[PDB]
Amino acid sequence: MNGPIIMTREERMKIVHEIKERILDKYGDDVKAIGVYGSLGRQTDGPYSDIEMMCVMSTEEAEFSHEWTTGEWKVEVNFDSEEILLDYASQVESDWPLTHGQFFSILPIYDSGGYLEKVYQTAKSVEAQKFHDAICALIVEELFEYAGKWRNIRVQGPTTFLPSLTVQVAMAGAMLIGLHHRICYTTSASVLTEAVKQSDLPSGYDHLCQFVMSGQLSDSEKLLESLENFWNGIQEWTERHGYIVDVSKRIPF
Amino acid sequence: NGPIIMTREERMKIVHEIKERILDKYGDDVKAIGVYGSLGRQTDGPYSDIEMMCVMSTEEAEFSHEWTTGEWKVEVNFDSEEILLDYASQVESDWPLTHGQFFSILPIYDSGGYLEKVYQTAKSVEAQKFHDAICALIVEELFEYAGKWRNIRVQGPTTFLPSLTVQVAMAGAMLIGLHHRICYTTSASVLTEAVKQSDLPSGYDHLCQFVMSGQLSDSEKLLESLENFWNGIQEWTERHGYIVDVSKRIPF
Ligand SMILES: NC[C@@H]1O[C@H](O[C@H]2[C@@H](O)[C@H](O[C@@H]3[C@@H](O)[C@H](N)C[C@H](N)[C@H]3O[C@H]3O[C@H](CN)[C@@H](O)[C@H](O)[C@H]3N)O[C@@H]2CO)[C@H](N)[C@@H](O)[C@@H]1O
Ligand SMILES: NC[C@@H]1O[C@H](O[C@H]2[C@@H](O)[C@H](O[C@@H]3[C@@H](O)[C@H](N)C[C@H](N)[C@H]3O[C@H]3O[C@H](CN)[C@@H](O)[C@H](O)[C@H]3N)O[C@@H]2CO)[C@H](N)[C@@H](O)[C@@H]1O
Ligand SMILES: Nc1ncnc2c1ncn2[C@@H]1O[C@H](COP(=O)(O)CP(=O)(O)OP(=O)(O)O)[C@@H](O)[C@H]1O
Ligand SMILES: Nc1ncnc2c1ncn2[C@@H]1O[C@H](COP(=O)(O)CP(=O)(O)OP(=O)(O)O)[C@@H](O)[C@H]1O
Ligand SMILES: [Mg+2]
Ligand SMILES: [Mg+2]
Ligand SMILES: [Mg+2]
Ligand SMILES: [Mg+2]
């Protein structure tokens, strides 16, 4: 295969409706709804964009996907029962701002009973405690661990890992901001650009992203200084907004 | 103040305190306790964290405790024997990054060779699972990455190119690790160990130099390096028989 080729929006929609016809032929009355998400669902797909579709099934324990390429383009179709999809849409993980824009993206092509609207309503009505818990977990599970990794790099290397680690920290900060503002990023390319347009950023985040977005990640000393400043801004930011975790016990169970 | 400097001896004081707490709370439901990660290999650095794994007799047991004291951080995983053995034999795209855990285990408590059984399962995974994982990685990740950087070339934004290049270099390291059935030591050594492997895809080493040095500001040279690597993938997969099915427009 020659990799992804240039395709028009008209050609991608022709593939979508061919897939819709095959889905309806194969699964029949078990198909509750079919939608397009991603850049094609918003009709902002570029020349090399891929195709992603979702399907709501009546069958229980239905949870499978077909993801393939023809050599020229690539398609991903997810099949989930209504209960599995609604449960997934109301769970807030650390990468929620990156995954759950799909449920604010849906272009319905087939819907037998407002199922896609019910999915959208569920995803947008998640109670605030779930975001609070996810933010506190993100600090412990990812950010604290990253700080140990770059502090280890400072004292024992290797600096060849620092550029990759810096990108990962900037992405983790984008998740932190996305959970706080309850915004889902449009595409992977817009994660950092949209994260730095949000108000009330932790101190040092925008400066750190400037290194990552510009690609100037060769000055290891300035990166470590930028990472520590971001880490300091995190601790001030979390206390100011009340994302406080009790850390007083050596063993909390 | 973030993670503080700690010695290996101090980390082993914490490991054995947690072991006693696990045995007191869960009692006879504990089959085995081990340390993995850098502490399990006894190569932990001054700021390294602590990760432990526990084998439980309780059916469907699958939970974790992950916390910080403000000075250090600990993660303890609790899994039933069946859940752990199934996970140890399952090969995902990030297998070379995740499953070194099962080649790291420092046993602390074991009532019946359970940690050794997990180790045997992880090292005896069927070769076909790596073949399938490689083909899936190409379709699900690398092909998607190629579309993203080709979109960047024609419409931007180049502000995503440095992060995307890091992700492609990491994916290529997973590809090499899956082919050689090797698990990387730590996340910091993934790229350095990946370029020391024999039979790399053409263009991979050149792409990794940009990522390891941090020189990711030349968007034109990065896009050229990415295309060469992408071209080298097709020669590489054909050479090893990692053939991707492209015959169906709709494969269901
Ligand atoms: N434990 C055995 C198996 O683990 C799986 O989860 C795997 C994976 O999702 C999970 O990843 C978890 C995350 O989720 C969680 N939100 C934060 C946590 N730090 C992270 O932990 C993992 O990633 C860290 C680096 N970022 C590593 O330092 C750490 O040692 C590693 N356990 O760790 C597990 C592998 O170690 C499944 N739970 C289940 O199939 C089974 O229980
Ligand atoms: N479908 C609803 C839910 O999706 C979950 O999976 C989520 C996630 O793991 C999964 O990620 C899958 C991977 O796995 C698979 N190995 C490659 C595939 N490209 C990727 O797809 C996802 O990541 C891509 C970006 N790299 C996106 O382009 C794509 O739109 C997105 N669906 O996509 C889902 C979120 O979009 C669970 N399967 C299940 O809880 C339930 O089915
Ligand atoms: N790593 C990720 N994992 C899961 N979903 C993601 C994701 N990154 C982005 N998304 C969500 O899944 C949708 C499609 O993801 P992608 O195909 O990776 C980029 P896109 O938004 O479709 O534009 P593009 O493919 O033309 O570049 C996004 O619109 C977004 O809602
Ligand atoms: N994303 C990931 N998911 C699951 N396991 C991972 C993982 N990344 C690395 N690992 C596994 O979990 C172990 C511990 O991971 P980490 O704590 O993140 C780095 P380490 O190997 O312990 O050295 P360090 O903590 O001193 O930096 C790794 O050795 C590896 O076996
Ligand atoms: Mg897309
Ligand atoms: Mg996609
Ligand atoms: Mg560790
Ligand atoms: Mg760890």
Side-chain angles (χ1 to χ4, degrees):
Chain A
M1 51 183 175
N2 50 9
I5 68 168
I6 278 165
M7 298 196 51
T8 68
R9 182 138 54 237
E10 285 64 68
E11 294 172 312
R12 276 188 278 267
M13 293 302 299
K14 184 180 173 64
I15 291 165
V16 153
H17 285 283
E18 286 174 26
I19 290 163
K20 172 198 175 256
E21 166 168 64
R22 179 56 189 142
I23 289 166
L24 288 182
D25 175 61
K26 175 172 187 76
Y27 297 107
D29 292 337
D30 285 279
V31 175
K32 293 161 108 170
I34 305 169
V36 186
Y37 67 101
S39 71
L40 185 55
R42 311 179 296 266
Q43 305 278 272
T44 63
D45 43 299
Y48 298 95
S49 301
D50 64 335
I51 304 166
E52 38 239 317
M53 307 169 53
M54 77 199 274
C55 183
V56 184
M57 306 287 281
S58 61
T59 299
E60 207 101 357
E61 309 156 76
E63 194 194 320
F64 62 98
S65 55
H66 286 112
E67 188 164 0
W68 76 95
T69 175
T70 67
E72 295 182 333
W73 68 83
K74 148 190 196 330
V75 189
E76 169 179 355
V77 191
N78 313 123
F79 302 78
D80 294 282
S81 83
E82 183 179 6
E83 176 181 2
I84 288 175
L85 192 51
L86 289 176
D87 175 74
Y88 176 79
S90 55
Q91 294 325 294
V92 182
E93 313 283 342
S94 65
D95 60 348
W96 178 92
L98 190 57
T99 60
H100 278 47
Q102 147 186 11
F103 309 117
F104 309 90
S105 269
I106 304 171
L107 170 46
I109 56 179
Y110 176 83
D111 200 327
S112 60
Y115 297 108
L116 295 178
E117 173 65 22
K118 195 184 324 167
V119 169
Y120 167 69
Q121 289 297 326
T122 296
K124 76 191 281 288
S125 305
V126 169
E127 314 166 271
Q129 185 66 45
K130 299 185 145 292
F131 294 94
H132 189 279
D133 296 346
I135 281 165
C136 293
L138 181 53
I139 302 293
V140 183
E141 306 179 1
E142 278 196 68
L143 288 170
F144 189 102
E145 196 155 339
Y146 286 146
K149 282 180 164 59
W150 79 60
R151 285 176 179 181
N152 262 337
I153 284 175
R154 183 190 82 239
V155 301
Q156 66 173 26
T159 60
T160 52
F161 183 48
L162 198 48
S164 294
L165 181 54
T166 300
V167 166
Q168 299 178 4
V169 174
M171 287 298 302
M175 303 299 106
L176 180 64
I177 288 146
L179 293 168
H180 176 67
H181 290 300
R182 281 143 228 171
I183 58 99
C184 287
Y185 297 103
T186 298
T187 70
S188 59
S190 75
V191 172
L192 295 185
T193 58
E194 307 180 2
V196 298
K197 308 169 268 135
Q198 303 306 308
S199 60
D200 203 347
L201 303 183
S203 289
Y205 182 69
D206 47 22
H207 191 218
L208 178 73
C209 284
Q210 192 168 82
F211 290 105
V212 175
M213 286 184 293
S214 67
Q216 283 303 340
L217 298 154
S218 69
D219 197 320
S220 292
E221 200 179 78
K222 284 173 161 283
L223 291 190
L224 290 162
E225 178 176 342
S226 188
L227 288 161
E228 291 287 345
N229 291 347
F230 177 51
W231 187 228
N232 290 336
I234 288 170
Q235 322 294 131
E236 185 280 321
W237 189 85
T238 55
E239 307 158 352
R240 175 147 48 72
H241 290 106
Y243 302 126
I244 308 303
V245 49
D246 190 308
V247 303
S248 59
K249 300 190 71 169
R250 282 175 79 90
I251 309 173
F253 69 86
Chain B
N1 49 9
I4 70 168
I5 284 159
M6 288 194 25
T7 70
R8 181 138 58 237
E9 169 181 343
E10 293 173 314
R11 276 184 275 265
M12 295 302 302
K13 276 240 74 197
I14 294 167
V15 158
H16 286 284
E17 287 175 28
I18 293 158
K19 169 206 67 184
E20 298 181 7
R21 181 66 195 114
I22 288 166
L23 290 177
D24 283 346
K25 174 171 184 75
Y26 296 108
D28 288 337
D29 288 3
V30 177
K31 287 167 150 184
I33 302 171
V35 187
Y36 67 100
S38 72
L39 184 56
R41 311 182 295 269
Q42 305 275 271
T43 66
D44 42 301
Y47 296 98
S48 301
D49 64 334
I50 300 166
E51 37 248 322
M52 302 169 50
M53 74 199 274
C54 301
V55 184
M56 307 292 282
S57 63
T58 296
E59 209 79 5
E60 307 294 330
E62 196 196 322
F63 61 98
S64 290
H65 285 303
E66 189 163 0
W67 74 96
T68 184
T69 67
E71 298 182 335
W72 68 87
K73 145 188 193 63
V74 189
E75 167 178 351
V76 189
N77 314 126
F78 302 80
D79 295 286
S80 79
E81 179 181 11
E82 179 181 4
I83 290 170
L84 193 54
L85 290 176
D86 282 351
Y87 174 77
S89 57
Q90 267 271 289
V91 179
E92 311 283 342
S93 295
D94 60 353
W95 179 90
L97 182 62
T98 61
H99 276 49
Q101 148 184 9
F102 308 113
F103 309 91
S104 282
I105 303 171
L106 190 167
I108 297 297
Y109 174 80
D110 202 329
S111 61
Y114 295 102
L115 293 177
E116 160 75 14
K117 191 182 180 192
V118 169
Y119 166 67
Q120 287 300 329
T121 295
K123 78 193 280 285
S124 305
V125 172
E126 284 150 21
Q128 185 63 44
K129 305 185 149 176
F130 296 94
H131 187 281
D132 294 346
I134 281 163
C135 294
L137 186 153
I138 297 158
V139 177
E140 299 176 0
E141 282 161 62
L142 282 177
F143 192 100
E144 196 168 320
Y145 290 150
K148 287 176 170 178
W149 79 62
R150 285 174 180 179
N151 265 340
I152 287 175
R153 180 176 76 239
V154 302
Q155 67 176 29
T158 63
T159 56
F160 183 47
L161 201 52
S163 295
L164 179 54
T165 303
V166 170
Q167 301 177 6
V168 174
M170 286 300 303
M174 302 298 104
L175 183 69
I176 290 148
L178 290 168
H179 170 68
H180 292 301
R181 277 69 128 156
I182 64 100
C183 287
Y184 295 107
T185 297
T186 197
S187 60
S189 72
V190 169
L191 293 182
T192 52
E193 290 180 8
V195 301
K196 289 171 175 303
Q197 300 307 308
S198 66
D199 217 345
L200 303 180
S202 179
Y204 181 69
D205 179 84
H206 188 243
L207 183 73
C208 278
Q209 298 308 319
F210 290 107
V211 175
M212 288 183 293
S213 70
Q215 293 290 178
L216 299 150
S217 72
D218 198 324
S219 292
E220 195 180 22
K221 277 64 174 83
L222 291 189
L223 289 162
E224 176 178 281
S225 189
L226 287 160
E227 290 289 344
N228 292 343
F229 173 53
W230 185 231
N231 289 335
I233 294 299
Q234 223 83 350
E235 182 278 326
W236 186 87
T237 61
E238 236 170 50
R239 219 196 299 146
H240 295 296
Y242 303 128
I243 308 303
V244 184
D245 195 314
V246 298
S247 53
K248 312 312 153 214
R249 288 182 87 247
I250 309 172
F252 63 90

